[PDB]
Symmetry: C3
């Protein structure tokens, strides 16, 4: 397998020294830079950049600057997704975001693990753990979501949370580590 | 009431689809953008932008870039307020900052709540909870202050704190959630 | 002593009103601004700026934008140091970083303490507590490292950690406050 295929199959891959992945990260980063230096009221320019970054035709995806991602094409987005300032979608592992998602400022969605053993880590290896973000969710600011985590549909993550484990749907969860506090009444 | 008046009166308001608030947020964001792209040594330009953003004549308010706010005019500032890099004053609810305030880097002052019910939330409703920051205070970096929180005068908030409840004056408080650790001797 | 010499000797110094330190912070902040506004693929320009900022000839030090530091020359770097987006090396106290160091996004390395007494603090005084970062270390994103803290070689700091005390070598440590969870097998 290529190191890309490895990455996408949840296997250890050489994130650092693989030329194809290096170049793909460089593509995303230069688009992020342009976007981060595009005036917020330049609506069409920003939409075009966002669509180029994510390699998709977004439907009411609003990204406040600055924004960062590793690949861009490995973030799959629903409609009506509001991302406030200073978020980072580190998407070596796929980041799936549903519809009607409110993301607070300074949130990081982190799919990259490195080996704990420094000898393996220094050789460039990573393993990507996909993140799935349910539809109809809200994240407060300053949240980190760690590799492999799924947040169920209808759930609310409190500001400052570090989400180390999956959160069931219809749940209010807060803290470091993030723990479910109570169920949310999502009735019509 | 207009949605603005609702916002300012602590009532549920349509933050997302109200044109007047949309345009007011767009005003602030374009000023922030200009300020964030103004060389740090361009003293006068930065002061003029800051005064335009906050709609006031500031006295020794120093804002390190980047900075963000939603309205700008809903942040009321004392003199001698030092705001380090990457702070966000999300001021739908008023944010009152006293004199001689030191704000560390990456601090978020968050006044916005959304409904927990995703049906109400997806309709664009928010409720703003004012933040009051006492005079003679110090915030470490990476702090988040949540809606409705008052930090008393003379108090110190430790780096990484998530401040969910009011902090009494003359207090050292740290943690997630932030809790008072001890009293501070602020004697002359 | 000059206030610089005081700063570097772990004594209370006037950080705010000393002209020489003010001008040194202005040098670093204008280099950061240029760097933060240099296209990520402008490899040689970014290296020249990084070497100017740190006043050294770096060996495979890669800094993702944006980046911030107070002095630049008070950060001493090994080789193979990877710094992801939105870090702040607040280096009034020396920040020593070893070889083969992976630093996650939105990490703050904070050497500045202010007096707790608001009277002394408002007079501009600080005391700098050096940070030492071991070789062969990995920091997840959203980590704050507080003044005086040493992280031993071969150690891993989990995302969201607030590191208030020294962490021994060969350790996995996480949390707010950060606590050692287990030893890491770093064997060849
Ligand atoms: C969780 C949240 C939604 C508030 O929920 P809440 O249940 O009304 O808050 P409560 O008063 O019930 O707090 C319940 C307990 O949980 C704690 N708590 C609430 N939010 C917390 C958080 N984010 N982190 C840690 N603890 C938290 C409170 O300290 C409280 O402690 P107690 O056991 O002494 O009562 C809060 O994070 C919030 O407002 N988040 C969004 C803020 C924000 O980021 N806005 C910007 C994005 S729009
Ligand atoms: C709170 C602070 C001032 C340290 O204060 P301190 O007087 O050293 O407090 P202590 O170390 O006596 O605190 C006692 C306990 O609180 C804990 N603690 C201290 N700061 C903490 C924080 N920020 N978060 C969580 N726990 C903290 C310590 O781990 C200590 O644990 P113990 O039970 O093992 O003793 C620290 O947050 C700080 O320096 N903040 C500013 C650093 C910074 O952000 N600088 C950049 C902006 S200038
Ligand atoms: C700790 C970390 C490094 C991985 O370690 P890990 O082996 O999953 O941790 P463990 O499972 O041994 O730890 C056991 C406990 O620690 C908790 N934990 C793990 N990471 C944590 C974190 N960052 N903060 C708080 N708690 C954490 C778990 O909830 C678990 O609880 P339990 O034992 O009660 O179930 C995690 O932060 C991580 O994935 N870090 C990198 C993520 C990142 O930032 N990537 C971007 C930069 S590449």
């Amino acid at each position: 397998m290529t190191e890309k295929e490895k990455m996408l199959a949840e296997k250890w891959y050489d994130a650092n020294f693989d030329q194809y992945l290096i170049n793909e990260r460089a593509r995303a980063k230069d688009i992020c830079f342009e976007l981060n230096h595009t005036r917020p009221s330049a609506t069409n320019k920003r939409k075009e950049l966002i669509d180029q970054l994510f390699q998709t035709t977004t439907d009411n995806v609003s990204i406040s600057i600055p924004f960062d991602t590793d690949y861009g094409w490995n973030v799959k987005l629903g409609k009506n997704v509001y991302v406030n300032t200073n978020c980072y979608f580190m998407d070596g592992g796929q980041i799936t975001i549903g519809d009607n998602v409110f993301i607070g400022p300074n949130c990081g969605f982190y799919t990259a693990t490195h080996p704990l053993n420094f000898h393996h880590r220094n050789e460039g290896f990573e393993k990507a753990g996909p993140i799935h973000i349910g539809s109809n969710t809200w994240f407060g600011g300053h949240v980190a979501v760690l590799p492999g985590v799924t947040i169920g549909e209808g759930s609310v993550i409190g500001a400052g949370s570090v989400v180390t484990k999956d959160i069931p749907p219809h749940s209010l969860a807060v803290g470091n580590p993030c723990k479910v506090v109570r169920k949310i009444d999502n009735d019509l």
